[PDB]
Design an enzyme around this catalytic site. Structure first.
Site, mmCIF file in Angstrom:
data_model
loop_
_atom_site.group_PDB
_atom_site.id
_atom_site.type_symbol
_atom_site.label_atom_id
_atom_site.label_comp_id
_atom_site.label_asym_id
_atom_site.label_seq_id
_atom_site.Cartn_x
_atom_site.Cartn_y
_atom_site.Cartn_z
ATOM 1 N N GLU A 28 8.114 0.905 0.024
ATOM 2 C CA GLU A 28 7.255 0.324 -1.010
ATOM 3 C C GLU A 28 7.986 0.390 -2.363
ATOM 4 O O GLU A 28 7.838 -0.497 -3.200
ATOM 5 C CB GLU A 28 5.958 1.117 -1.169
ATOM 6 C CG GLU A 28 4.962 0.545 -2.186
ATOM 7 C CD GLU A 28 5.069 0.999 -3.641
ATOM 8 O OE1 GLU A 28 5.952 1.867 -3.982
ATOM 9 O OE2 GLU A 28 4.296 0.434 -4.444
ATOM 10 N N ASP B 260 -18.017 -14.458 10.722
ATOM 11 C CA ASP B 260 -16.807 -15.269 10.517
ATOM 12 C C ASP B 260 -16.849 -16.040 9.182
ATOM 13 O O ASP B 260 -15.823 -16.187 8.515
ATOM 14 C CB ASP B 260 -16.594 -16.277 11.679
ATOM 15 C CG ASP B 260 -16.023 -15.646 12.937
ATOM 16 O OD1 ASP B 260 -15.713 -14.403 12.943
ATOM 17 O OD2 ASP B 260 -15.856 -16.437 13.923
HETATM 18 O O1 G8W Z 1 8.000 -3.362 -6.599
HETATM 19 C C1 G8W Z 1 6.749 -3.335 -6.851
HETATM 20 O O2 G8W Z 1 5.973 -4.349 -6.838
HETATM 21 C C2 G8W Z 1 6.096 -2.014 -7.295
HETATM 22 C C3 G8W Z 1 6.829 -0.794 -6.744
HETATM 23 C C4 G8W Z 1 6.364 0.532 -7.465
HETATM 24 N N1 G8W Z 1 4.934 0.738 -7.455
HETATM 25 C C5 G8W Z 1 4.314 1.747 -8.133
HETATM 26 O O3 G8W Z 1 4.949 2.729 -8.548
HETATM 27 N N2 G8W Z 1 2.959 1.622 -8.269
HETATM 28 C C6 G8W Z 1 2.099 2.637 -8.921
HETATM 29 C C7 G8W Z 1 2.151 2.322 -10.454
HETATM 30 C C8 G8W Z 1 1.476 3.486 -11.130
HETATM 31 C C9 G8W Z 1 1.828 3.595 -12.643
HETATM 32 C C10 G8W Z 1 1.136 2.512 -13.485
HETATM 33 O O4 G8W Z 1 0.012 2.198 -13.161
HETATM 34 N N3 G8W Z 1 1.727 2.107 -14.641
HETATM 35 C C11 G8W Z 1 1.204 1.125 -15.417
HETATM 36 C C12 G8W Z 1 1.761 0.890 -16.682
HETATM 37 C C13 G8W Z 1 1.279 -0.144 -17.489
HETATM 38 C C14 G8W Z 1 0.242 -0.988 -17.022
HETATM 39 F F1 G8W Z 1 -0.271 -2.105 -17.842
HETATM 40 N N4 G8W Z 1 -0.300 -0.801 -15.792
HETATM 41 C C15 G8W Z 1 0.183 0.247 -14.973
HETATM 42 C C16 G8W Z 1 0.663 2.548 -8.399
HETATM 43 O O5 G8W Z 1 0.199 1.391 -8.165
HETATM 44 O O6 G8W Z 1 0.019 3.632 -8.338
HETATM 45 C C17 G8W Z 1 6.728 0.444 -8.985
HETATM 46 O O7 G8W Z 1 5.798 0.035 -9.751
HETATM 47 O O8 G8W Z 1 7.906 0.762 -9.350
HETATM 48 ZN ZN ZN Z 2 3.547 4.592 -4.694
HETATM 49 ZN ZN ZN Z 3 5.835 4.511 -7.013
#
Ligand code: G8W
Ligand code: ZN
Ligand code: ZN
Ligand SMILES: *[C@@H]1O[C@H](CO)[C@@H](O[C@@H]2O[C@H](CO)[C@@H](O[C@@H]3O[C@H](CO)[C@@H](O)[C@H](O[C@H]4O[C@H](CO)[C@@H](O)[C@H](O)[C@@H]4O)[C@@H]3O)[C@H](O)[C@H]2NC(C)=O)[C@H](O)[C@H]1NC(C)=O
Ligand SMILES: *[C@@H]1O[C@H](CO)[C@@H](O[C@@H]2O[C@H](CO)[C@@H](O[C@@H]3O[C@H](CO)[C@@H](O)[C@H](O[C@H]4O[C@H](CO)[C@@H](O)[C@H](O)[C@@H]4O)[C@@H]3O)[C@H](O)[C@H]2NC(C)=O)[C@H](O)[C@H]1NC(C)=O
Ligand code: G8W
Ligand SMILES: *[C@@H]1O[C@H](CO)[C@@H](O[C@@H]2O[C@H](CO)[C@@H](O)[C@H](O)[C@H]2NC(C)=O)[C@H](O)[C@H]1NC(C)=O
Ligand SMILES: *[C@@H]1O[C@H](CO)[C@@H](O[C@@H]2O[C@H](CO)[C@@H](O)[C@H](O)[C@H]2NC(C)=O)[C@H](O)[C@H]1NC(C)=O
Ligand SMILES: *[C@@H]1O[C@H](CO)[C@@H](O[C@@H]2O[C@H](CO)[C@@H](O)[C@H](O)[C@H]2NC(C)=O)[C@H](O)[C@H]1NC(C)=O
Ligand SMILES: *[C@@H]1O[C@H](CO)[C@@H](O[C@@H]2O[C@H](CO)[C@@H](O)[C@H](O)[C@H]2NC(C)=O)[C@H](O)[C@H]1NC(C)=O
Ligand code: NAG
Ligand code: NAG
Ligand code: NAG
Ligand code: NAG
Ligand code: NAG
Ligand code: NAG
Ligand code: NAG
Ligand code: NAG
Ligand code: CA
Ligand code: CA
Ligand code: CL
Ligand code: CL
Ligand code: CL
Ligand code: CL
Ligand code: ZN
Ligand code: ZN
Lengths: 694, 694
Positions: free
Chosen positions: A370, A610
């Protein structure tokens, strides 16, 4: 009785705690041997827990790794080419882990190699509007410059794309204390804050839903045909590297040129935050040089897929999925979510062994890679697309269970709003001061809806996690839930230690959730939602909730258009067809709900279930959105400016964005009208799937 | 009893005769008032016949018409610009019809306007291989020439595309007696042959499945957004016009330059068939000039949609559809098919009024503007795509019921082979010398299978009719059936009077089917197939028949590749994955058939009927074939060289076609391998929809 209450009561805080400790003692980076060994442990334990079958599904995908003997770093160099300042090669490891090997050093996954040298420009958060301010108003040209940007607000991938299109020749990312250091709390290991030597890892791709960069549309199996690197999807064209705030202060403190345009450009370090270009007079002949030697490599990854076959509709699938790969120990991201999934499988398995089975099939998934672009989930879904689109009822994500200890957070399709309201009224609040009250009451009180008094906030789905292929490509009803903070201090970012070596078991057990009661509550929410989707006789979707948000989204996009009244007159821009379609959807959904309430007959049932299952599916356009063929949902896509945020009526929003700068207004307003037509048509066609069938 | 036999016996030859006479007294051109009036008559009569509901569905689509006061014609002009020869302005109308107005004169629908003048080149049938012979071997350059081509072998649209890409500045189409005049039979009105003044109408578009040229992907409804003409799909860029053989002899008889390359370039007229360019020495300063003033216009069209609701699965749809619009009287094309449909509705309505209902829903359709590019069917399907792909069991076409009086012709999906075998064994042969025998026996005897002794020929579906959107875009199991000739005399064309003013009621009643017994047999085949699809408890598809033809298609495409053994070695071209996938499909289909034979349980039923319905659907690729996004079926598409013919493994076939002429062999063999991967993956994914579901 074998009912939801038996399921819920078998879940234990103490089991989640044990599993989290077990999953977080060594690093589990995608593509490494230790992550394969953990996959083989999860498979063996889900079998012992009682599931009917448990398989690995493997793919060979493009991943990215630093060179062990040729480390990445950044320099200030003088007129002679002497390197007078060097950034760190590693984060200081936390207490007790100073002998663990195979900790990957900080890097930006999928950076090309390079050693560019040049003058620095400071670009704030590198958002679209930051670059508009620099170029249009301040007249500062980033062409051939190295840009330095602070993390926060938007996905790092969008920052890199923005810098590239402004002509930058490299990008430096840093964590500012303004955004990752909460007032009054201590640095790890004495608190949950980010120290000056801490650095955020993460990929910097712009995949737009493609999955593996080399195999868009098709699974990366044994015989797959691969694009060459030059035609790969979403790779950045300039080198990129992340640093902590001690190192950043050394790069920022000598900056010259223009002053910051206003106080929203200033972080918390003791530096002016000048924009540049380049350093002040004494140092104006010094420069910044990057050294990047990471390599891209095709590497094998492993999903774990568990099946609990349904007793009555084995051909209907309710999926609980979250990833297992981590940047280092994954104390929060992802193992706090994976430990919850483990306990959920164990409780459903307990019931199975006493002879119970759910009505519909449940599929349990431990996704790989991921962190390198949602690759394990996307490849499996490409492989199984025909099965998922004719049989997929719902998808419940399960990454991090906590990013705070204040209240609940839900993001989901409108189809699940009523389900989430009814389940949370039945669960106990774990919050201090709400003993004996429901989770609905505490959540509603700490996070009120902006629209309706007496209801809690539920957000749209964005992206940056493993539900993207299920929801925005295939059109399967999706949701996610976790405990979160009060967005009062750092209201523009996740948690301070995100994607850092300091994200440990100890981080969670000492500072976030010492009794594991927030984890247990999140297990009851995710698990309870899966139990209902899989066991209720009538699927627990309310089509009328979709009708209400569609009116909101139409009012909103019309309001954006009405900032241009003269052009709406000149090019005959009307939203009448969209409002007409939304009105029809409202009336047809209302009549469908009545019928669903009046009907001993399993065909009428299975016909009506459905119609509920295929309603999310109806919002899919097989032609996709412009230049983003894997974003097919016409109501929801990830924002073109920020993969984390959701946008509503995305085709229309993007046709309207910055439209006053377009050179040929007639052509640009023509495309607005085309997008109105597509949205109106799609909403009307979705409503008609709920009409009587013949 | 209300069973298939009651349905079949209520059908009468004499009713079909009456309806054909009623449908063919005036012209019914798409977009004209007389075609609207007939739609309003069909709707009113299907209601009286008993259907539950009958609606018009209207669209506004691009059509094409000659200018009434500025007629189309062609000339020979001399050095002075005097017009010394003029082609006819109209066909001599047949006996008794010499006062009917509104007969559209011969024209090529969608020709641009122009008056180009130039020297003639003769290009045989204007096939790909005719142009290869001219350019590669004879070294004749068509650039800036007017080309004259004989109708036959391939769809006229492909002829126009071929001429355009060779640099022609106009195209003249003619009917040669070699291809449209059967030895020993007389000219209309004393026989069924084409007279020297007769001309074939027809459209010359290259739509590749798009439907209305201005609205690809979306229905042409009231609020639709339209492309401008310049971005329209499939319009030709040079003027085009059709002529008869008297006029053609005047254009051909003075031709000079090179002799015809061999006797396959010579028709039956008393002319040398020289290729040109230009006329022989005495006339070498004369030239040919076209005058074309047709206009394209957005015009309203009307489909009629009748519904007979199912008693048990009202949400499963069996569709009987054929068009109603004609070029002039439509004696064969389409009214011989539409009269059969009318009688089929009447018999199902008879049963309905005595209280019967089919198990599944039946939809009856009278399509408009088929002659202008399958526009009425394609627009309705774009509107209703979500309903058709989740609920569509099958589609049975119903254009012309006869093109001869010799034996049966079926073209269909392998999924319907066993259904067609079992029904035809139950029907009586109408053929002289087979009294008291089955239709299976006479058909098998006059049209043996090329592969299996004791079985009849059944062909693949091609295109050029209204099943195209259902089968090659949406992936709904489709078929068609009619009486045909012994392909002994004109074995490279339909019937002599195709798309001519001479196609009349009298043509049919006097020369093709005086007792209407071939029409009655075709009504029993089409009607019987619809009855079984709609009423059988288990859908009448046999997945194992698909397994057998997939092995045939794989052997065939491998054989084409193996003409290039050195390149297959150099670029590591393997078909192993495709043969592996076909083997797996064979074994999984065999096990599925056993399960279908062992199982009181309606869920297991409805689960297994859904696996049968969704099996055709599994062959669809949502990314489409290269540059033909509306051809989505990976096993079958219309030939890139001839819309009438079907091609198997089309993606691979086209990657291999003429590959020895490609400049970059490495890139071309790379694309072969990509297409092998897509085909193998798709076949394996289709097989897995027949595995146990959990
Ligand atoms: O490649 C991808 O699509 C995502 C891979 C990875 N996914 C995550 O780490 N996802 C976390 C992101 C958590 C941190 C977060 O929410 N940061 C954030 C910063 C600014 C904003 F507007 N929204 C969210 C999650 O969904 O829990 C990344 O973002 O590097
Ligand atoms: Zn994650
Ligand atoms: Zn992550
Ligand atoms: C929401 O639901 C309603 C159904 O209750 C649906 O209403 C339909 O609106 C269309 C307009 O888009 C109507 O179409 C008309 O049909 C009649 C024949 O019945 C035609 O004569 C009309 O065409 C003439 O008038 C036009 C309008 O000025 C002219 O420009 C044109 O050239 C013609 O002269 C027109 O096509 C349709 O009848 C109703 N259907 C009903 C009331 O049942 C509405 O479309 C739905 N909204 C969406 C977005 O689908
Ligand atoms: C038709 O059906 C059969 C199922 O009966 C199916 O067989 C599968 O073939 C694939 C090959 O494409 C096998 O994949 C292997 O899986 C094992 C793990 O179980 C791996 O170790 C293998 O990888 C190694 O070996 C490769 C081959 O040389 C190396 O190049 C590679 O680097 C690895 O070292 C390999 O991935 C799979 O096990 C079987 N499945 C079975 C037998 O259940 C076949 O694929 C189907 N055909 C199609 C077209 O799908
Ligand atoms: O626009 C289109 O796709 C087709 C419109 C129209 N369709 C038809 O007339 N279809 C007839 C075509 C009948 C004549 C025919 O079959 N000719 C023929 C010639 C050569 C060959 F290889 N195959 C068929 C039918 O399907 O019955 C046309 O072809 O102009
Ligand atoms: C996490 O838990 C698992 C399962 O209990 C441990 O793996 C087991 O270890 C024991 C002792 O070595 C073996 O007998 C089993 O073969 C293992 N089972 C598996 C892999 O399913 C694992 O060692 C624990 N890890 C940590 C870090 O405590
Ligand atoms: C959430 O709970 C509400 C309140 O119980 C459910 O709505 C009721 O459902 C019953 C049974 O269908 C109806 O007879 C009541 O009249 C409904 N009350 C209403 C609409 O106020 C609702 O269906 C539940 N949502 C689910 C299960 O998704
Ligand atoms: C074809 O048949 C139809 C139906 O019998 C004829 O239309 C009917 O004509 C009678 C006498 O004018 C009227 O009373 C009805 O209103 C018509 N019914 C309709 C349109 O449903 C039609 O005239 C016949 N056409 C020909 C050429 O014989
Ligand atoms: C066509 O007819 C054949 C012969 O009757 C059908 O095959 C038989 O079906 C019955 C009932 O399922 C089986 O018990 C027999 O053993 C079958 N005989 C065979 C396969 O030789 C066949 O199913 C029919 N095809 C249809 C209805 O599509
Ligand atoms: C890692 O770096 C060294 C240079 O110091 C180089 O020789 C080696 O090839 C690199 N490994 C790669 C590119 O995988
Ligand atoms: C930075 O690293 C380089 C290469 O390892 C070295 O030549 C230089 O001395 C270092 N500079 C400082 C200040 O440590
Ligand atoms: C930015 O700099 C480069 C020249 O080095 C130039 O190509 C580009 O147009 C410049 N844009 C400006 C000065 O606005
Ligand atoms: C846990 O909750 C307390 C109570 O408000 C709060 O002060 C503390 O900051 C929280 N911990 C985290 C990591 O948010
Ligand atoms: C038809 O032809 C005449 C020219 O003789 C022209 O004036 C008229 O506009 C034409 N009609 C069209 C283009 O529809
Ligand atoms: C052909 O038609 C044109 C225009 O109507 C006319 O000038 C010419 O005389 C005609 N030629 C012959 C041979 O009829
Ligand atoms: C055909 O003719 C034109 C010149 O009038 C030219 O552009 C084209 O290349 C020619 N091809 C030949 C002679 O092969
Ligand atoms: C009708 O059948 C007879 C008997 O062979 C045949 O000679 C005649 O040509 C047929 N009519 C047509 C139109 O094919
Ligand atoms: Ca892929
Ligand atoms: Ca269209
Ligand atoms: Cl999540
Ligand atoms: Cl963040
Ligand atoms: Cl047909
Ligand atoms: Cl033909
Ligand atoms: Zn036809
Ligand atoms: Zn036709």
């Amino acid at each position: 009785k074998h009912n939801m209450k038996a399921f819920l009561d078998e879940l234990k805080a103490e089991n989640i705690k044990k599993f989290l400790y077990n999953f977080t003692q060594i690093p589990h980076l995608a593509g490494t041997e230790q992550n394969f060994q953990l996959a083989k442990q999860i498979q063996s334990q889900w079998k012992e827990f009682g599931l009917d079958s448990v398989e690995l599904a493997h793919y060979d995908v493009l991943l990215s790794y630093p060179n062990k003997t040729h480390p990445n770093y950044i320099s200030i160099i003088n007129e002679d080419g002497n390197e007078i300042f060097n950034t760190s090669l590693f984060e200081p490891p936390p207490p007790g882990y100073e002998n663990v090997s195979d900790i990957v050093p900080p890097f930006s996954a999928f950076s090309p190699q390079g050693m560019p040298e040049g003058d620095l420009v400071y670009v704030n958060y590198a958002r679209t509007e930051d670059f508009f301010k620099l170029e249009r108003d301040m007249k500062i040209n980033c062409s051939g410059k190295i840009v330095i940007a602070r993390y926060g607000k938007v996905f790092r991938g969008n920052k890199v794309k923005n810098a590239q299109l402004a002509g930058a020749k490299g990008v430096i990312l840093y964590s500012d204390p303004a955004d990752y250091f909460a007032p009054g709390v201590k640095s790890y290991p004495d608190g949950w804050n980010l120290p000056g030597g801490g650095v955020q890892r993460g990929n910097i791709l712009n995949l737009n839903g493609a999955g593996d960069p080399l195999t868009p549309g098709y699974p990366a199996n044994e015989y797959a045909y691969r694009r060459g690197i030059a035609e790969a999807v979403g790779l950045p064209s300039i080198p990129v590297h992340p640093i902590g705030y001690y190192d950043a202060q050394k790069l920022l403190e000598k900056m010259g040129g223009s002053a910051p345009p206003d106080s929203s450009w200033r972080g918390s370090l003791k530096v002016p935050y000048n924009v540049g270009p380049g350093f002040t007079g004494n140092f104006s002949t010094q420069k910044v040089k990057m050294h990047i030697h990471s390599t891209n490599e095709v590497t094998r990854i492993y999903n774990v897929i568990g099946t609990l076959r349904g007793a009555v509709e084995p051909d209907r699938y309710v999926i609980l999925g979250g990833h297992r790969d981590s940047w280092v120990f994954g104390g929060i991201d992802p193992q706090s979510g994976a430990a919850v999934v483990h306990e959920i499988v164990r409780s459903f398995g307990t019931l199975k062994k006493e002879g119970w089975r759910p009505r519909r099939t449940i599929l349990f998934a431990s996704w790989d890679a991921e962190e390198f672009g949602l690759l394990g989930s996307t490849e499996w879904a490409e492989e199984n697309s025909r099965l998922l689109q004719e049989r997929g009822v719902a998808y419940i994500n399960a990454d991090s269970s906590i990013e705070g200890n204040y209240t609940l957070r839900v993001d989901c399709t409108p189809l699940m709003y009523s389900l989430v309201h009814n389940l949370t009224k039945e669960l106990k609040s774990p919050d201090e001061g709400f003993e004996g009250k429901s989770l609905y009451e505490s959540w509603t009180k700490k996070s009120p809806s902006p629209e309706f008094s007496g209801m809690p906030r539920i957000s749209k789905l964005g992206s940056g996690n493993d539900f993207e292929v299920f929801f925005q490509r295939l059109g399967i009803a999706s949701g996610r839930a976790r405990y979160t903070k009060n967005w009062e201090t750092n209201k523009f970012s996740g948690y301070p230690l995100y994607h850092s070596v300091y994200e440990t078991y100890e981080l969670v057990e000492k500072f976030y959730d010492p009794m594991f009661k927030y984890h247990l509550t999140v297990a009851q929410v995710r698990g309870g939602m899966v139990f209902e989707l899989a066991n209720s006789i009538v699927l627990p979707f309310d089509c009328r909730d979709y009708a209400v948000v569609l009116r909101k989204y139409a009012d909103k996009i019309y309001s954006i258009s009405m900032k241009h009244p003269q052009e709406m007159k000149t090019y005959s821009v009307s939203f009448d067809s969209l409002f007409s379609a939304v009105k029809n959807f409202t009336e047809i959904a209302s009549k469908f709900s009545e019928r669903l309430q009046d009907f001993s007959n399993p065909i009428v049932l299975r016909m009506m279930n459905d119609q509920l299952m295929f309603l999310e599916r109806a919002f899919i356009d097989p032609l996709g959105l412009p230049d983003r063929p894997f974003y097919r949902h016409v109501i929801y896509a990830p924002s073109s400016h920020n993969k984390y945020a959701g946008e509503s009526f995305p085709g229309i929003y993007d046709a309207l964005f910055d439209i006053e700068s377009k050179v040929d207004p007639s052509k640009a307003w023509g495309e607005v009208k085309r997008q109105i037509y597509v949205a109106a048509f799609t909403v009307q066609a979705a409503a008609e799937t709920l009409s009587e069938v013949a």
